[PDB]
């Protein structure tokens, strides 16, 4: 195949680094697979990665703990609003259990397209999550402590985008982005990668024309963008060219973000999309010891003291 294939990673702005470890590792049972430090013009900021065992597309979660900038983002309508993990069928109560046990309030369990889910928030920034019973998801769960292999989530089921302009967003998914509407209930419209069988291939659009646009900038409490897996850099370039061709001339240059190749476009629904080529997480760290070594970026050669600043104010354990 030669177009975007599935979801790849999602990227959110959170509070403290320890907040995320406590949540993504100790609560969700994901492996801490990479940690990096970059300089954002003012202060050092972590870029943390969380996935299954080896950072496979459709399970990767990336975070910028951004409590140390004053910026607090506004939940709103032109952004991703909810990230949804797939858990095995029958596992909801255990999750409600091992979530409440951790002090994380959960909400009214529901059904969405026939499958059960419950919502809850990242304790340290407010971002919205769900666990959803997918009997059709056969992906290998990562075996951590914290969560037994019987009940482990096995990657992302779907992401939910709030959008004010639905018609033109639908056009973009079908014509530029290799998705097709596969369902609709209420104001929720569900799109799936054309052809696919794998899980982690679902984007739900919430039509909310009424609602004020959310924050687009890097600020605490927000999902900054969603990324989609593309087989290689050629398909990437082609998607960029044809998408520019129809008018989205804001398709970015290809950026190396460490462990993947990224191009960014602002869709007519107001949501940043990424077309991503995968680089792996092992090329600079031992498989057995992922997430232990802090990869600090070359901008710190002149200001090493800031590394020490990040380690104590945003401590990682």
Q: Which stretch binds Fe ion (CB under 5 A): 164-172, 186-194, 203-211, 225-233?
A: 225-233
Q: Which of residues 254-283 bind its own copies (CB under 8 A)?
A: 255, 262, 264-266, 268, 270, 272
Please state, in angstroms and rounded to a whole number, the distance separating the CA atoms of residues 44 and 189.
39
- Binding window for its own copies (CB under 8 A); candidates: 27-35, 119-127, 239-247, 279-287: 239-247
Which is closer to its own copies, CB of 26 or CB of 74? 74
Q: Which of 186, 249, 283, 304 forms a contact with its own copies (CB under 8 A)?
A: 249
Q: Which does 206 bind (CB under 5 to 8 A by kind): its own copies, Fe ion, none?
A: none
Q: Which residue, 108 or 253, has its beta carbon nearer to its own copies?
A: 253
227 binds, among Fe ion, its own copies, none (CB under 5 to 8 A by kind): Fe ion
CB of 239 to Fe ion, least distance (A): 15
261 lines the binding site for Fe ion (CB under 5 A) = no
Q: How far apart are CA 148 and CA 170, in angstroms?
A: 39
In a 3-state reduction of DSSP, which class is residue 136? Answer: coil
Contact between 224 and its own copies by CB under 8 A: the answer reads yes
**C-beta separation of 28 from 123 below 8 A:** no
Binding at 246: pick from Fe ion, its own copies, none (beta carbon under 5-8 Å per type): its own copies
**Residues marked as binding for Fe(3+)?**
9, 225, 274
Closest among 216, 245, 240, 241 to 228, alpha carbons compared: 240
- The DSSP line for 80-112 is EEEEEEEE-TT-HHHHHHHHHTTT--B---EEE
DSSP conformation class of 271: -
Check binding of 187 to its own copies (CB under 8 A).
no
Q: Is 242 in the site for its own copies (CB under 8 A)?
A: yes
- Mask for 274-303, x = binds Fe ion (CB under 5 A): x-----------------------------
Residue 79 interacts with Fe ion (CB under 5 A)? Answer: no
Between vectors from CA 63 to CA 121 and to CA 56, what angle results, nearest 5°?
Answer: 100
What span, in angstroms and rounded, lies between the C-alpha atoms of 55 and 115? 26
Q: Which residues pair with 11 in a beta bridge?
A: 62, 225
Taking the CA atoms of residue 50, residue 48, residue 5 and residue 173 in that order, the dihedral angle to the nearest 10 degrees is: 120
Nearer to its own copies, 26 or 238 (CB): 238
Q: How far apart are CA 257 and CA 259, in angstroms?
A: 6
1-30 residues in contact with Fe ion (CB under 5 A) are: 11
* Rounded distance between C-alpha atoms, residue 204 and residue 300, angstroms: 40
Work out whether 40 is an interface residue with its own copies (CB under 8 A). yes
Q: Strands 31-39 and 255-256: what pairing? A: unpaired
Q: Which is nearer to Fe ion, 152 or 227 (CB)?
A: 227
Classified as helix, coil or strand, 308 is helix
Q: Is 217 in the site for its own copies (CB under 8 A)?
A: yes
Instruction: Please give the size of the binding site for its own copies, defined by CB under 8 A.
Output: 32
Q: Is 303 in the site for its own copies (CB under 8 A)?
A: no
- Classify residue 248 as exposed, middle or buried by CB count within 10 Å of its CB (0-12, 13-18, 19+): middle
| CA–CA distance, 5 with 182 (Å, rounded to integer) | 16
Contact residues for Fe ion, defined by CB under 5 A:
11, 227, 274
Contact residues for its own copies, defined by CB under 8 A:
40-41, 164-165, 168, 209, 212-213, 215-218, 224-225, 242, 245-253, 255, 262, 264-266, 268, 270, 272
């Amino acid at each position: 195949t030669n177009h975007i294939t599935s979801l790849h990673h999602i990227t959110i702005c959170t509070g403290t680094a320890q907040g995320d470890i406590d949540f993504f590792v100790k609560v969700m049972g994901q492996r801490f697979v990479k940690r990096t430090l970059f300089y954002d013009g003012s202060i050092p900021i972590y870029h943390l990665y969380f996935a299954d065992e080896l950072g496979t597309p459709g399970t990767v979660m990336t975070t910028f703990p951004t409590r140390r900038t004053g910026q607090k983002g506004r939940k709103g309508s032109n952004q991703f609003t909810v990230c949804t993990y797939a858990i095995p069928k029958g596992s909801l109560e255990w999750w409600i259990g091992h979530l409440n046990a951790h002090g994380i309030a959960t909400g009214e369990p529901g059904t969405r397209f026939g499958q059960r889910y419950v919502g809850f928030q990242h304790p340290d920034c407010g971002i919205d999550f769900e666990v959803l019973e997918d009997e059709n998801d056969t992906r290998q769960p990562y075996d951590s402590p914290y969560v037994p292999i019987e009940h482990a989530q096995r990657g992302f089921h779907s992401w939910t985008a709030s959008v004010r302009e639905l018609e033109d967003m639908d056009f973009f998914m079908e014509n530029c982005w290799n998705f097709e509407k596969i369902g609709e209930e209420g104001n929720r419209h569900r799109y799936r990668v054309k052809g696919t069988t794998e899980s982690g291939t679902i984007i739900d659009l919430l039509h909310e024309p009424d609602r004020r646009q959310g924050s687009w900038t890097i600020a605490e409490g927000i999902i900054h963008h969603g990324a989609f897996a593309v087989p290689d850099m050629d398909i990437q370039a082609r998607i960029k060219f044809e998408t520019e061709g129809v008018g989205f001339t804001d398709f970015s240059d290809r950026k190396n973000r460490g462990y993947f190749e990224s191009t960014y476009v602002r869709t007519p629904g107001g949501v940043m999309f990424e077309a991503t080529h995968s680089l792996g997480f092992t090329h600079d760290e031992d498989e057995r010891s992922l997430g232990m070594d802090l990869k600090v970026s070359p901008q710190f050669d002149d200001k090493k003291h800031l590394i020490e600043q990040a380690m104590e104010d945003d401590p990682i354990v």
